[PDB]
Design an enzyme around this catalytic site. Structure first.
Site, short mmCIF file in Angstrom:
data_model
loop_
_atom_site.label_atom_id
_atom_site.label_comp_id
_atom_site.label_asym_id
_atom_site.label_seq_id
_atom_site.Cartn_x
_atom_site.Cartn_y
_atom_site.Cartn_z
N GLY B 112 41.34 34.83 35.58
CA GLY B 112 41.91 36.08 35.97
C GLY B 112 43.22 36.19 34.84
N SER B 113 43.29 35.59 33.81
CA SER B 113 44.18 35.97 32.87
C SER B 113 43.95 37.25 31.96
CB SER B 113 44.45 34.88 31.63
OG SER B 113 45.09 33.69 32.37
N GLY B 116 39.14 36.58 28.92
CA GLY B 116 37.92 36.38 28.77
C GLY B 116 37.45 34.75 29.00
N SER B 118 36.63 32.71 31.40
CA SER B 118 35.33 32.22 32.22
C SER B 118 34.24 31.97 31.16
CB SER B 118 35.19 33.33 33.42
OG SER B 118 36.00 32.99 34.41
N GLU B 150 25.49 32.22 32.83
CA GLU B 150 26.40 32.64 33.89
C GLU B 150 25.87 33.66 35.00
OE1 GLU B 150 29.97 34.12 31.95
OE2 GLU B 150 31.36 34.36 33.85
N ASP B 162 32.71 39.12 26.44
CA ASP B 162 33.35 37.86 26.09
C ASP B 162 32.48 36.73 25.58
OD1 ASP B 162 35.36 39.30 27.80
OD2 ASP B 162 35.16 37.95 29.51
CL LIG Z 1 41.06 34.97 31.28
CL LIG Z 2 38.97 38.50 31.48
#
Ligand SMILES: [Cl-]
Ligand SMILES: [Cl-]
Ligand SMILES: [Cl-]
Ligand SMILES: [Cl-]
Ligand SMILES: [Cl-]
Ligand SMILES: [Cl-]
Ligand SMILES: [Cl-]
Ligand SMILES: [Cl-]
Ligand SMILES: [Cl-]
Ligand SMILES: [Cl-]
Lengths: 345, 345
Positions: B112-113, B116, B118, B150, B162
């Protein structure tokens, strides 16, 4: 039409040896410092002006404006480094004829951060003038000029390592000797060692240190006043800089952390305010969380700390530092030294 | 004796186009995304074990341990991505025969930052196995494999950009089309443009976003349910990604900031929770301080923000952001994609 030039120079993490580059120790015994430039920068900008004036702007946004005169600018205590760089360049490369320009600086870290910003800012101002005037100054010459401007022209006491990190870039082992003689040894570290080191280092900004001038004074006094135990601590700082250098060249992380620990004890014993209760508390907590070694990056008394942590304890250490007063970041090294570019003309 | 492998992959700043890579939009109209890897990393480590077991350790330090069995590992909802990578690699490159190992991850930024992380973590786990098993997977293949693991094996909804930033590295303009067809355009940006951009960008971490899945859902719904105004906002996101790409290739900073502004309006209008009162307050304050443009880096709703600020207002902007809740940092780009090294064997 006006010319616009910018220059940048990377800031640096003091890995080992800091304190052996203070004037009496280096001149008496020879100093060693191991340091490495990181991904944070000091910047200078030159803008030529169309009015007959010279303007100086600092990182903390002080501003001075002078009429275009054919006398050197007085070093009145406001923006002395800016004026001393300008003065040297006008006298030595423009036949004493003033140039109408604005010289400004800004930086990715404040003074007292322990990342060598003060001297790096002098280097970058010099580099901006090298680009403006197309000067043939080599890296040794830029570093020496920066040292002279700050320490002699401006009479500001300090070390010798930051000028070289800012100018040369990368990982360097520096030998400091009497009569302003310095040898820079660029270390050609293996790619896996650099990646492993980055994966193992956590940075922690504890706030601005107000102890640097004091620590440097005390370390210089140790030698002049023959404080035997304190000189012996400094001898230990020096020994461990070499041990750490060789550990990096050999990719020996066991020896690297053992040397950082011994080096940190030595550094604390060389001057009373290098550490304090508050730093020791952060340090103890980091060790508890799984860090193997650590140190204040610069002279001491606050600023950036670095921790070596095995990768399986890295997140735990990041979480723990979260409980304390300061800012966590990763550590990414840069290989390039100071550089310049143009925006107009 | 055990083998130890580590891999890292850089995180990324979303410069433009994000949202046009959601499945219904990309498949229907074609998506564009402009992004660039920075100096922050996701990491994976493989340690071979001497006990018949497989162990998975995550960034937030969850831990699973399984007996060595000849059936695929169940995706029970605990560490599914770790298990799906392990499952694919055992089935496709080890003839279904289990390998005794520990697979661990850690990251320089939390989920959630907006950087990218995950998908970058899936890439780096794959890279660690490429190094362990000496696989001939090229960059397109690594990125596609990460996407499949994913989004398909683990059924997690999301974007397409990402995987490519994490694998390829550098500044890339990506074209997304129907049938999982992606074209990566590495941008060969002039050195002065990269330096000028770094000197002009300030990052600000506002805290973890909990909106990403929601924003992506809403953007996918815009297309499926024919929300005309919202689809038109998305069309604007797409247009401005191209405008920004060309501005970088031309070194046109005026066009770059104009496109970021238009792009940020478009992004906010494409889904309700992309921004909020709290983000808008930070954004308004940044503009007041002298920033020319800015945006949330990822899907939206929190995480990293980036600001473009002329150099003469940079310190003022840094000081102002100091008054708000979050962490300021500089922006340094990295040219390298995912890489691996060995520690034992
Ligand atoms: Cl992130
Ligand atoms: Cl992100
Ligand atoms: Cl040091
Ligand atoms: Cl300054
Ligand atoms: Cl500093
Ligand atoms: Cl310092
Ligand atoms: Cl130091
Ligand atoms: Cl974006
Ligand atoms: Cl993870
Ligand atoms: Cl994005």
């Amino acid at each position: 039409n006006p010319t616009i030039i910018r220059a940048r120079a990377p800031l640096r993490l003091g890995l080992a040896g800091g304190g052996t580059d203070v004037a009496p120790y280096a001149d008496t015994f020879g100093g060693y410092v191991l340091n490495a430039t990181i991904d944070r920068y000091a910047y200078a900008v030159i803008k030529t002006l169309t009015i007959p004036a010279v303007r100086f702007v600092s990182t903390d946004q002080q501003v001075e404006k002078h009429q275009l005169i054919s006398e050197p600018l007085e070093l009145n205590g406001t923006l002395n480094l800016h004026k001393a760089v300008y003065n040297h360049m006008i006298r030595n490369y423009n036949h004493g004829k003033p140039i109408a320009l604005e010289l400004s600086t800004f930086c990715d870290a404040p003074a007292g951060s322990g990342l060598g910003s003060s001297s790096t800012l002098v280097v970058v101002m010099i580099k901006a003038f090298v680009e403006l005037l197309n000067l043939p100054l080599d890296d040794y010459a830029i570093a020496q000029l920066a040292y002279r401007i700050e320490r002699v022209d401006c009479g500001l006491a300090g070390g010798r390592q930051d000028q070289y990190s800012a100018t040369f870039g990368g990982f360097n082992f520096m030998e400091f000797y009497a009569a302003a003689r310095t040898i820079v040894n660029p270390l050609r570290i293996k790619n896996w060692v650099l990646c492993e080191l980055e994966a193992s280092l956590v940075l922690f900004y504890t706030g601005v240190s107000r102890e640097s001038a004091k620590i440097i004074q005390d370390q210089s006094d140790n030698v002049v006043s023959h404080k035997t135990a304190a000189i012996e601590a400094m001898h230990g700082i020096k020994r461990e800089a070499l041990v750490m250098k060789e550990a990096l060249l050999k990719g020996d992380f066991k020896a690297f952390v053992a040397s950082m620990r011994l080096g940190w004890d030595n550094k604390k014993n060389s001057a009373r305010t290098v550490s304090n209760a508050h730093i020791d508390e952060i340090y103890d907590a980091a060790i508890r969380a799984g860090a193997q070694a650590g140190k204040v990056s610069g002279a001491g008394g606050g600023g950036f700390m670095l921790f070596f942590v095995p990768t399986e304890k890295r997140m735990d250490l990041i979480r723990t530092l979260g409980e304390y007063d300061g800012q966590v970041s990763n550590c990414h090294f840069t290989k390039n030294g100071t550089q310049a570019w143009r925006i107009a003309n």
